[PDB]
Design a protein around this ligand. Structure first.
Ligand SMILES: [Fe+3]
Ligand SMILES: [Fe+3]
Ligand SMILES: [Fe+3]
Ligand SMILES: [Fe+3]
Ligand SMILES: [Fe+3]
Ligand SMILES: [Fe+3]
Ligand SMILES: [Fe+3]
Ligand SMILES: [Fe+3]
Ligand SMILES: [Fe+3]
Ligand SMILES: [Fe+3]
Ligand SMILES: [Fe+3]
Ligand SMILES: [Fe+3]
Ligand SMILES: [Fe+3]
Ligand SMILES: [Fe+3]
Lengths: 163, 163, 163, 164, 163, 163, 164
């Protein structure tokens, strides 16, 4: 049976993952106005990943006998001036999610709620994959924004085809 | 291409469908605290249906060249005192969705936006199925809440097995 | 070839079977307003059986070289005050159909129309199955209307599952 | 949920489709007395189509929470003096059904019952296929009733075998 | 070659198993007049099992070179005032069959007819299964005859569905 | 629905078919003592046919809403001095069954119980097959009991093999 | 390799899981005397799960080079006055198993026996599933023990058949 401090943080995380899904949907919509159709598709698909993260928390909470709460989710209209600004926002958002998961893990360990600690390892692992994915996409966007960079990528693509 | 009045209403509907998904998730969670597991599963699954309704609007808006907006979605904590009160809320919520769709259809017809009019016919048909589903579930819940009612259903179940 | 007296009775039976189909359709519609969905489905399906009874008579008449006549079919609006009253009506109606078939069989025998006599044996057999079906459904409805009865059926269902 | 005016018209249509099924059964029976066996089979099969039209209305009404009503269906005995007179009756009947559907669509639009309006679009489409089917069958009957017409159809049949 | 005392008892058992089949048929018929269709089907199917018990004794006797005798089988008309009274009769009847088999086994052992002793082990085993089946059905009928009992079974059924 | 006179006769027939099964079982057992193993197998199998005749009547009676009654079945010990005497008894027994079915058919026709009349046509047809079977077996037995007869059959068997 | 304090606790847990299996067998036997056949079958099957929990600990201990010990397992005769009292005992028993596993995890962490810590994560996860299972079964039993409760479940079952 979940302590109140852990419950509140798990419910905060449910709400955070829900907000991520909506954020990525909104990014997708903006990207389509820039004709960045593949990046839009990526964010659309990834919104569906964030919905799965949400549901898995939601279920764990309910299975423990507490009541999961969705809360308020507010998605700001698209401010972004360029695709790089959007990718920076996405990456920082994923860093903040990782922070939140780490806090949650730390507090489960501190309260000796080992059940929540082991449940959260899935998220710790997933956030490693998320940071890798989003940092890497940002890094490429910055490179591809330069002519020297576009030449590097042309070589890399030649290697992908030739060998 | 989309007029501002229609765009604002379509985006309102996007947000309304998003709120429905979250509302039904929240109902599902509450139902699990009552040990109403099958009803909880129904609402969980239906939250996924509302998400599909949302995405289909979202796409139509983006395909027309406008920018779909998710907005703010606020889900109140579970007030419900019984499963009947929750079913009443779900049914009324579906009526309100139908109202909103009808207002949208009416306004498309009035502006001679025939493209949005025909796109919405899917929703007009879907809301007929939704009202049937939720009214019927509420009616049964009220009947099953009385002893006379539980006797009717016992006969109906005998007919389902016997013939 | 068919005598006028036998033709007029066969055409009466065509019309009677048509009226039965419409009756059972109407009963189905009423049962849906009571939320007796399985009973409604039974009466809907059975309306299709009555249509088959009709068509088989209709074809026999036409094959003999006479002209089958549908006539007027009038279905009274739903009077029924309970599902038991409806089942009583259905059972009495099936008794009347059997009476009508028996009169028809008797008159074919009396006129030595052995062809019509043998054609009707299918109906004599079918009406035995109909009476069994409808009497049995009525009997169960009367039993299930009592608390003692619902306890008997709970045991019978335990036997269906256990052995 | 359904307004009374729409409910009454949908129930009228239920009854009208039921009367069509019976009408076409009766036509089938008459056609058999003329040894027009294929035309009889067509009308028999089409009576089954009219039943499906009926049931679909019936179900929509019941799904909305109202009570569908079958009503009285009266089928006059076969008056018809020729197959052409019968085909004219069938075609006019189908024109009347279309009228009745159009009235129903128009009244749903006027009351802003968009749910009934969209449900009826199936019927609007179906009645276009019905008018095409019956008008075309009538037209061919009139042509075939003339010697010049039979010659046209003999050529058309030669094309069906030789090329198409 | 069978002793006269063993032969007479084996033939008595043949007749007893025959009487059981007829008894269970008669019970089946009565149960149908109470609309206990599943219990009726059980007794009908079980009459077939008793016939198989009869035939297996019948064959053993004939294979040893003696002449199996069916004898007189008298089945009283249905006295039963309730399904529980009928189940009590069925259980007691099975207890009497077991007694009769045990007497038969005991006599074979006493006369050192080891062939008949080993043949009868099948029946000893089968009667354990019969007593389990019939005692269990009686017990459940008594429980289900009460409101507290019907609540226990409702929980048990929930466990059958949930886990 | 069944008249008392028809019910009593149907229940008589139930009992008669039951007695036939037991009679043929008893004949089978006697035949085995004469080493007539194939004839014994025929009677054993045919006892199963008589059980089916019984069950079909039993079911019809119950389906009409009356209570089928098995009654007393008494099987005399085997008197038979030869296989021919047994075959004569079997044939005469089948003649008596046919008589009993005919009386039953005649009574149904007289009371205008057309439902029982048509149900019985199956038995009228089956008894034609039964009389053919048993008369033919008796006739062959009488022929084979003579040396002239065994010579005829030796020729017939030659024709079965040669052509 | 295993410290004596960890070894003694792992062997205690081996013995605890063995006792659980026997407890659930004994509950199964009692439930059969009440004609609660499905609940009996559940406890019987679950005794087999507890045996698997036992064997997995037993194997880990042996793989580390220490000697696993079964010990004494004593199963009291069935005291239970109702199925609810039995389900309460089962649930509390599972809570006590969780407590032991948590103590074991906690002491592995203190001693920096990370190997035993990671091995035990399986049990931490499993005991979450166990508590869910048993608490939920208890909660339903309490609800079904009331007439209002049986009415709720009748509705829930209608939803299982009609929609889900
Ligand atoms: Fe996430
Ligand atoms: Fe993420
Ligand atoms: Fe929706
Ligand atoms: Fe909806
Ligand atoms: Fe009929
Ligand atoms: Fe009928
Ligand atoms: Fe039509
Ligand atoms: Fe039409
Ligand atoms: Fe036996
Ligand atoms: Fe037995
Ligand atoms: Fe027979
Ligand atoms: Fe026979
Ligand atoms: Fe365990
Ligand atoms: Fe456990």
């Amino acid at each position: 049976m979940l302590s109140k401090t852990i419950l509140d943080k798990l419910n905060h995380q449910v709400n955070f993952e829900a907000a991520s899904a909506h954020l990525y949907l909104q990014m997708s919509a903006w990207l389509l106005t820039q004709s960045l159709d593949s990046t839009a598709a990526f964010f659309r698909a990834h919104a569906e990943e964030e919905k799965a993260h949400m549901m898995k928390l939601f279920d764990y909470i309910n299975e423990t006998g507490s009541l999961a709460l969705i809360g308020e989710v507010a998605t700001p209209a698209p401010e972004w001036k360029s695709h790089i600004e959007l990718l920076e926002a996405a990456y920082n958002h994923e860093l903040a999610i990782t922070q939140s998961i780490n806090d949650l893990v730390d507090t489960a360990l501190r309260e000796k709620d080992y059940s929540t600690f082991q449940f959260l390892q899935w998220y710790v692992a997933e956030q490693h994959e998320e940071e890798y994915l989003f940092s890497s996409m940002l890094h490429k966007a910055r490179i591809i924004n330069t002519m020297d960079g576009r030449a590097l990528f042309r070589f890399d693509e030649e290697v992908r085809k030739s060998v």
